[PDB]
Design a protein around this ligand. Structure first.
Ligand SMILES: Cc1sc2c(c1C)C(c1ccc(Cl)cc1)=N[C@@H](CC(=O)OC(C)(C)C)c1[nH]nc(C)[n+]1-2
Length: 110
């Protein structure tokens, strides 16, 4: 069983993976495939990869002790994108749109 706040977190995750947000969320659905995208320095710059599928694996595996642990991974995913990319990159705008969803839903958690 998931914690009560973790159930809410799992619900936020389900929304982030859902068709509603797919126009901006899709780059975050799986780990960055550095070689497929020809980002040959990605793993040098980003030492701790994170993406929504990994958050799902961890949630399903009951790895998060609390909502804070969940949020730290979601924010890591966004932060990796901001860290790697020039701020004017299209993927940064997509990350930001998804983060707006995340931060709003997470903040509204009673
Ligand atoms: C599957 C994935 S994962 C991803 C991207 C894609 C495509 C995109 C991207 C996504 C959508 C649009 Cl319209 C454009 C780019 N950008 C790269 C970084 C980059 O420099 O890639 C290009 C070499 C420019 C492709 C990046 N950084 N962090 C992430 C999560 N991504």
């Amino acid at each position: 069983k998931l914690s009560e706040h973790l159930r809410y977190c799992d619900s936020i995750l389900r929304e982030m993976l859902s068709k509603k947000h797919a126009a901006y969320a899709w780059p975050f659905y799986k780990p960055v495939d550095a070689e497929a995208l020809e980002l040959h320095d990605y793993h040098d710059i980003i030492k701790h990869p994170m993406d929504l599928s990994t958050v799902k694996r961890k949630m399903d595996g009951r790895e998060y002790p609390d909502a804070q642990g969940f949020a730290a991974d979601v924010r890591l995913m966004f932060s990796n994108c901001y860290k790697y990319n020039p701020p004017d990159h299209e993927v940064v705008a997509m990350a930001r749109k998804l983060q707006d969803v995340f931060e709003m839903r997470f903040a509204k958690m009673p």
